[PDB]
Amino acid sequence: PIVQNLQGQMVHQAISPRTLNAWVKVVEEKAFSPEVIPMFSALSEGATPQDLNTMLNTVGGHQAAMQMLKETINEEAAEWDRLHPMREPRGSDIAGTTSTLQEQIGWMTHNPPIPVGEIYKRWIILGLNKIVRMYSPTSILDIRQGPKEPFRDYVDRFYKTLRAEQASQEVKNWMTETLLVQNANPDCKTILKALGPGATLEEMMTACQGVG
Amino acid sequence: PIVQNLQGQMVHQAISPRTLNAWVKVVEEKAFSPEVIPMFSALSEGATPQDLNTMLNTVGGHQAAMQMLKETINEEAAEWDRLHPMREPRGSDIAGTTSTLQEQIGWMTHNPPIPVGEIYKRWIILGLNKIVRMYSPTSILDIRQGPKEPFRDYVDRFYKTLRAEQASQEVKNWMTETLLVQNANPDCKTILKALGPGATLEEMMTACQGVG
Amino acid sequence: PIVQNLQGQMVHQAISPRTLNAWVKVVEEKAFSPEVIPMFSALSEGATPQDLNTMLNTVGGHQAAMQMLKETINEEAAEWDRLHPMREPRGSDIAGTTSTLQEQIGWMTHNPPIPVGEIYKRWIILGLNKIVRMYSPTSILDIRQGPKEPFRDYVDRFYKTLRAEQASQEVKNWMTETLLVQNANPDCKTILKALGPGATLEEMMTACQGVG
Amino acid sequence: HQAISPRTLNAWVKVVEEKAFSPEVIPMFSALSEGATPQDLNTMLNTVGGHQAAMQMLKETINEEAAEWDRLHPMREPRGSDIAGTTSTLQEQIGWMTHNPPIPVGEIYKRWIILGLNKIVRMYSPTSILDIRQGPKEPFRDYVDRFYKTLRAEQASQEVKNWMTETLLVQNANPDCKTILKALGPGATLEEMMTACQG
Amino acid sequence: HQAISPRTLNAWVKVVEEKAFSPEVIPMFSALSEGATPQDLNTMLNTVGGHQAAMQMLKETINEEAAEWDRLHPMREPRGSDIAGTTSTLQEQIGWMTHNPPIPVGEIYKRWIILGLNKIVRMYSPTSILDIRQGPKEPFRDYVDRFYKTLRAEQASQEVKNWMTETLLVQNANPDCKTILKALGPGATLEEMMTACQG
């Protein structure tokens, strides 16, 4: 992180141990559920490349996830160097392996701020999105409401799987509009189709409140 | 947040990573149970509009909840601009999208304090109340004591659903007075009606202690 | 830990009580699952030998784990003294039993930094790896997919046991490549073998999504 | 201006009657109505004998589109009725195409008719694409032909159709073919898919 | 510019439906689509009712060829999609066809479609060549016709097909004519082969 000293000069602030422990708990217990990405974003707010590499070290227990995260980081660094051929931050500098700590702090504290931390964070988020896409327990087409399950639980599962799938935005809109209604159980499906097309999710949940 | 510097001049204090992680856990695990609103109020004490937008970013995983929260924020900003046509905070300024950080700190630190953080917080709380109202698993009329369930558990469920429903206050009073007694199981319902009308909840719980 | 004073001179920072409580929870609840090692690494970031001994004291509830950790520490200290016959840190100094606190801070704050904390941490990590290797509930050859279990759960179990086993890296690669396919259930195993050899884990998980 | 040919009109009538309403009616109508005027279009629509319910849908959709056009817009310029040809002379219809520069009155009405026909064929498709699934013994060839006909009739966005082709074709198939298709794995072509799945 | 004739489109759909995807479909398409612009070709393909699996193979092959064209060749120059007619306008296609030197987008698209149709026919060959064989009483005049129809469907290389005609034909022949072919011996033309086989 970054914080002002007593006089005011910006200086690197070490990431606290309990934050890293929380991130380790997130990596281990959750098994790369779709909820990790918001948790990673929260636990890494203001992170520099050194801190992000510290988090990646804990990620590195899983060989496959670590390998794909490294591959996506390398690819995005190559893209950055392709687009953009204290020195200007290169791809490896954004990756926090060649650039030193002081260069990172200077880049983040520059006027205007060079968002090295944020760009590296978004690369990591893309890699984590891919990893999450692997570990989705089932595809969206397999989510089906049970004979007795409440509509709220089915919608929760459907939207979780939708976050996992990471399709195109228009595809997601069509999915929520049509596939949600299609896969519902018959007793609910009658009411959903009677509501008609273009029904907002608020109408859908209110109409089917406790039908099961 | 806001905190005095070493000399004493007010300056923005960044929201800690672990607080945002806790808020993410609240958004994800709880599935918008009625308990989120107190937890949101606690986790966002002293929040500025920038911090509240930071929390909203984590909320933004859910498309429907994020959409309705944005819609309520826009509506309340329009209401604010309608009522009230460093510059005075406009609706978008309260929303923390046009106003800069320093303007927010100045507004909160003004004499008298302009409660930009609190008004934005209450708008967010209204939106979250609506979202919670969607995700209520069952309506209040479906809560019914089981044949063996203790009275304390039934009352807990009833009051949770009452918090979820968000009806008029007089309607809530009538509901607690009459509907609670009506839906109780027959063995308890005999004692509840024998207690008579206008019985305080303390009398109701003490009388039916361990009846089931 | 280590942190700059108000003037800037480096001084020892005490390990917070809540960090030690979290480490105690990790030692007790987890029962030396493979996830402890990342959690230990996170909770002990920047630790000096005195802090590491403080953590070891909480570890010392378990007689066998404490004994083996002490034995590995002594062995690695003997190796350090063998390789390398304020004074230079001896093996017992790295162990944080002969060296005083101020010598440790001076070593860590030296130019270049003497990584006494990190070397002691890696010795502790080797000992914890051995302890974890004892407490593995089953060997890798016993992990077998169930008739109905999803492929994601089976892969999670397999990689957890692989982390526990701690074999040679090439052995691990062969294990993930062949033994994972061999032990899968027949309905999945058909698809895995149809995918052919040299299939990346991404292909394996995507192909067998929801087959069970 | 030239009169519509009896051969063309008979072809339109016979294809509509024979095909009832299948997705190829849209390209057939577009081909046979090449550069036609609103009077010719109305002739082609009214000439259809059967499927008067479908013709009612088409007229209702034309009226709705005309109302929207009138909402968007209050030689004399054309209103929705003028575009639909209900209140336009043949000379008036020739105008707005003979006008320099012309405003394509015929093409707008053709687009409205195409929207109505898309709705009609979507209604006339006997099953939904998500409900299309393989029989226990149906050939994979017949399954995929039915699936792609239904997908053609679906009237959805193009990216949605691409995802549909990528996923539901493999997914909705029976387990016997599903095993072979998964063994082929993603990124394969339909040609490879059927050639492998011949048995 | 003149649009495709309704008689031509009706003939095309008629022959496609009646013949299925037999080998003659390719030359028939080449005949009917002479000088046809990409818009006309797209209409010609879209109007086909049924065989949507075949139309999907055709679309996929067109997309692959368009990608190859775009890779090889990076008014505005025509792209692969423009040749395919999905993106480029009718006027743009007409201008490209009229330009000197010409960019015959029609001919390139026709060649791509011919490739796709060849692949489709090779898929659609009902029985492999090795399976065809003379019956106990089937005349040689019909057995050889079946054999050569299938051989045209298979679309193997000429070097293979020489051996196929030389050996597989005589091998699969019925026992009565097998002896006659063997006696007649190698270096034989089809006229000799049949004219030695009657009865």
mmCIF file of N, CA and C in Angstrom, chain D residues 7-8 11 14 19 23-24 27-28 30-32 34 141 144-145 148-149 152 165 188-191 194-195 198, chain E residues 1 3-4 6-7 9-10 13 39 43 46-54 56-57 60 64 119 122-124:
data_model
loop_
_atom_site.group_PDB
_atom_site.id
_atom_site.type_symbol
_atom_site.label_atom_id
_atom_site.label_comp_id
_atom_site.label_asym_id
_atom_site.label_seq_id
_atom_site.Cartn_x
_atom_site.Cartn_y
_atom_site.Cartn_z
ATOM 1 N N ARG D 7 -46.882 -14.464 -63.123
ATOM 2 C CA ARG D 7 -46.004 -15.561 -62.734
ATOM 3 C C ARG D 7 -45.423 -15.321 -61.347
ATOM 4 N N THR D 8 -44.955 -14.098 -61.089
ATOM 5 C CA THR D 8 -44.407 -13.782 -59.775
ATOM 6 C C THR D 8 -45.475 -13.877 -58.695
ATOM 7 N N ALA D 11 -46.265 -17.463 -58.015
ATOM 8 C CA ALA D 11 -45.170 -18.071 -57.271
ATOM 9 C C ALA D 11 -45.236 -17.701 -55.797
ATOM 10 N N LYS D 14 -48.239 -19.568 -54.193
ATOM 11 C CA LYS D 14 -48.058 -21.005 -54.068
ATOM 12 C C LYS D 14 -46.982 -21.334 -53.045
ATOM 13 N N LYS D 19 -45.551 -23.851 -48.194
ATOM 14 C CA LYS D 19 -44.629 -23.834 -47.071
ATOM 15 C C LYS D 19 -45.293 -23.448 -45.760
ATOM 16 N N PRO D 23 -38.855 -20.644 -42.328
ATOM 17 C CA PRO D 23 -37.939 -19.491 -42.362
ATOM 18 C C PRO D 23 -37.571 -19.018 -43.757
ATOM 19 N N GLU D 24 -37.600 -19.891 -44.765
ATOM 20 C CA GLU D 24 -37.241 -19.469 -46.115
ATOM 21 C C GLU D 24 -38.268 -18.532 -46.737
ATOM 22 N N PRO D 27 -36.515 -14.892 -47.069
ATOM 23 C CA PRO D 27 -35.751 -14.641 -48.298
ATOM 24 C C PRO D 27 -36.575 -14.766 -49.562
ATOM 25 N N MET D 28 -37.562 -15.665 -49.608
ATOM 26 C CA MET D 28 -38.382 -15.762 -50.810
ATOM 27 C C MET D 28 -39.163 -14.478 -51.044
ATOM 28 N N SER D 30 -38.337 -11.504 -49.899
ATOM 29 C CA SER D 30 -37.380 -10.457 -50.233
ATOM 30 C C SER D 30 -36.960 -10.542 -51.693
ATOM 31 N N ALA D 31 -36.778 -11.757 -52.205
ATOM 32 C CA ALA D 31 -36.392 -11.922 -53.600
ATOM 33 C C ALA D 31 -37.524 -11.522 -54.534
ATOM 34 N N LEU D 32 -38.730 -12.027 -54.279
ATOM 35 C CA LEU D 32 -39.836 -11.778 -55.195
ATOM 36 C C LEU D 32 -40.306 -10.333 -55.155
ATOM 37 N N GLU D 34 -38.442 -7.622 -55.180
ATOM 38 C CA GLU D 34 -37.255 -6.823 -55.462
ATOM 39 C C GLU D 34 -37.676 -5.511 -56.113
ATOM 40 N N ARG D 141 -27.781 -36.730 -37.778
ATOM 41 C CA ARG D 141 -28.016 -35.872 -38.935
ATOM 42 C C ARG D 141 -29.387 -35.212 -38.860
ATOM 43 N N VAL D 144 -29.552 -32.620 -36.024
ATOM 44 C CA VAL D 144 -28.915 -31.329 -36.243
ATOM 45 C C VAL D 144 -29.652 -30.541 -37.314
ATOM 46 N N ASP D 145 -30.242 -31.216 -38.303
ATOM 47 C CA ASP D 145 -31.027 -30.483 -39.292
ATOM 48 C C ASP D 145 -32.236 -29.816 -38.645
ATOM 49 N N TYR D 148 -31.029 -26.843 -36.493
ATOM 50 C CA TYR D 148 -30.643 -25.635 -37.206
ATOM 51 C C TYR D 148 -31.824 -24.967 -37.885
ATOM 52 N N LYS D 149 -32.825 -25.731 -38.323
ATOM 53 C CA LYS D 149 -34.043 -25.091 -38.807
ATOM 54 C C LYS D 149 -34.694 -24.274 -37.698
ATOM 55 N N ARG D 152 -32.773 -21.188 -37.020
ATOM 56 C CA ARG D 152 -33.051 -20.184 -38.035
ATOM 57 C C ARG D 152 -34.353 -19.461 -37.737
ATOM 58 N N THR D 165 -25.199 -21.974 -31.167
ATOM 59 C CA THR D 165 -24.571 -22.979 -32.015
ATOM 60 C C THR D 165 -23.387 -23.617 -31.307
ATOM 61 N N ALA D 188 -14.407 -27.560 -32.571
ATOM 62 C CA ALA D 188 -14.567 -28.387 -33.755
ATOM 63 C C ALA D 188 -15.628 -27.790 -34.676
ATOM 64 N N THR D 189 -15.703 -28.325 -35.891
ATOM 65 C CA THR D 189 -16.661 -27.896 -36.897
ATOM 66 C C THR D 189 -17.814 -28.885 -36.980
ATOM 67 N N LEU D 190 -18.917 -28.415 -37.567
ATOM 68 C CA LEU D 190 -20.083 -29.271 -37.749
ATOM 69 C C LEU D 190 -19.768 -30.440 -38.672
ATOM 70 N N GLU D 191 -18.941 -30.199 -39.691
ATOM 71 C CA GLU D 191 -18.533 -31.271 -40.592
ATOM 72 C C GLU D 191 -17.823 -32.377 -39.829
ATOM 73 N N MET D 194 -20.401 -34.275 -37.418
ATOM 74 C CA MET D 194 -21.239 -35.312 -38.012
ATOM 75 C C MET D 194 -20.412 -36.465 -38.565
ATOM 76 N N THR D 195 -19.241 -36.183 -39.146
ATOM 77 C CA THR D 195 -18.439 -37.272 -39.695
ATOM 78 C C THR D 195 -18.027 -38.244 -38.600
ATOM 79 N N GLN D 198 -21.239 -40.273 -37.310
ATOM 80 C CA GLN D 198 -22.038 -40.958 -38.321
ATOM 81 C C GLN D 198 -22.715 -42.194 -37.741
ATOM 82 N N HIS E 1 -27.769 -3.124 -63.211
ATOM 83 C CA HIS E 1 -27.924 -4.361 -62.456
ATOM 84 C C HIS E 1 -29.335 -4.912 -62.595
ATOM 85 N N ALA E 3 -31.898 -8.154 -61.135
ATOM 86 C CA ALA E 3 -32.049 -9.118 -60.060
ATOM 87 C C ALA E 3 -32.224 -10.531 -60.610
ATOM 88 N N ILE E 4 -32.020 -11.509 -59.726
ATOM 89 C CA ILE E 4 -32.191 -12.906 -60.096
ATOM 90 C C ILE E 4 -33.650 -13.165 -60.446
ATOM 91 N N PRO E 6 -37.278 -14.911 -60.699
ATOM 92 C CA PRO E 6 -38.057 -15.866 -59.894
ATOM 93 C C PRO E 6 -38.101 -17.252 -60.497
ATOM 94 N N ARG E 7 -38.120 -17.359 -61.827
ATOM 95 C CA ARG E 7 -38.033 -18.673 -62.456
ATOM 96 C C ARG E 7 -36.728 -19.361 -62.091
ATOM 97 N N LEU E 9 -34.849 -18.861 -59.380
ATOM 98 C CA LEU E 9 -34.867 -19.273 -57.978
ATOM 99 C C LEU E 9 -35.762 -20.486 -57.767
ATOM 100 N N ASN E 10 -36.935 -20.496 -58.406
ATOM 101 C CA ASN E 10 -37.832 -21.638 -58.283
ATOM 102 C C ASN E 10 -37.175 -22.899 -58.818
ATOM 103 N N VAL E 13 -34.436 -24.090 -56.188
ATOM 104 C CA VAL E 13 -34.978 -24.773 -55.016
ATOM 105 C C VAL E 13 -35.586 -26.111 -55.418
ATOM 106 N N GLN E 39 -25.170 -10.750 -53.430
ATOM 107 C CA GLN E 39 -26.538 -10.671 -52.930
ATOM 108 C C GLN E 39 -27.400 -11.766 -53.545
ATOM 109 N N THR E 43 -29.155 -14.930 -51.588
ATOM 110 C CA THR E 43 -30.559 -15.287 -51.759
ATOM 111 C C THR E 43 -30.702 -16.733 -52.218
ATOM 112 N N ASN E 46 -30.029 -18.920 -49.191
ATOM 113 C CA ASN E 46 -30.993 -18.770 -48.108
ATOM 114 C C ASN E 46 -32.327 -19.403 -48.463
ATOM 115 N N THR E 47 -32.749 -19.291 -49.723
ATOM 116 C CA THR E 47 -34.064 -19.792 -50.099
ATOM 117 C C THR E 47 -34.186 -21.306 -49.985
ATOM 118 N N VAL E 48 -33.077 -22.029 -49.842
ATOM 119 C CA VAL E 48 -33.134 -23.483 -49.776
ATOM 120 C C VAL E 48 -33.882 -23.896 -48.520
ATOM 121 N N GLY E 49 -34.964 -24.654 -48.702
ATOM 122 C CA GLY E 49 -35.714 -25.190 -47.582
ATOM 123 C C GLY E 49 -35.210 -26.572 -47.222
ATOM 124 N N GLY E 50 -34.953 -26.779 -45.935
ATOM 125 C CA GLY E 50 -34.423 -28.044 -45.475
ATOM 126 C C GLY E 50 -32.936 -28.153 -45.738
ATOM 127 N N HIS E 51 -32.368 -29.273 -45.292
ATOM 128 C CA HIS E 51 -30.929 -29.515 -45.395
ATOM 129 C C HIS E 51 -30.141 -28.408 -44.700
ATOM 130 N N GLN E 52 -30.659 -27.954 -43.557
ATOM 131 C CA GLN E 52 -30.021 -26.850 -42.856
ATOM 132 C C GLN E 52 -28.652 -27.241 -42.323
ATOM 133 N N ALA E 53 -28.415 -28.528 -42.070
ATOM 134 C CA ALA E 53 -27.064 -28.962 -41.744
ATOM 135 C C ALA E 53 -26.115 -28.697 -42.906
ATOM 136 N N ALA E 54 -26.554 -29.002 -44.127
ATOM 137 C CA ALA E 54 -25.739 -28.709 -45.297
ATOM 138 C C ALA E 54 -25.524 -27.212 -45.449
ATOM 139 N N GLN E 56 -25.430 -25.104 -43.101
ATOM 140 C CA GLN E 56 -24.513 -24.672 -42.055
ATOM 141 C C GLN E 56 -23.074 -25.025 -42.400
ATOM 142 N N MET E 57 -22.837 -26.210 -42.972
ATOM 143 C CA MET E 57 -21.497 -26.487 -43.488
ATOM 144 C C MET E 57 -21.092 -25.450 -44.519
ATOM 145 N N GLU E 60 -20.150 -22.248 -42.705
ATOM 146 C CA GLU E 60 -18.875 -22.362 -42.005
ATOM 147 C C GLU E 60 -17.711 -22.319 -42.983
ATOM 148 N N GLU E 64 -14.680 -19.573 -43.167
ATOM 149 C CA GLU E 64 -13.265 -19.931 -43.153
ATOM 150 C C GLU E 64 -12.542 -19.361 -44.367
ATOM 151 N N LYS E 119 -17.639 -30.595 -50.563
ATOM 152 C CA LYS E 119 -17.513 -31.235 -49.256
ATOM 153 C C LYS E 119 -18.850 -31.809 -48.799
ATOM 154 N N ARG E 122 -19.599 -35.009 -50.729
ATOM 155 C CA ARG E 122 -18.751 -36.089 -50.236
ATOM 156 C C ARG E 122 -19.272 -36.621 -48.910
ATOM 157 N N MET E 123 -19.774 -35.733 -48.053
ATOM 158 C CA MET E 123 -20.427 -36.188 -46.831
ATOM 159 C C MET E 123 -21.706 -36.957 -47.152
ATOM 160 N N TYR E 124 -22.468 -36.492 -48.137
ATOM 161 C CA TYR E 124 -23.810 -37.003 -48.383
ATOM 162 C C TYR E 124 -23.839 -38.284 -49.202
#
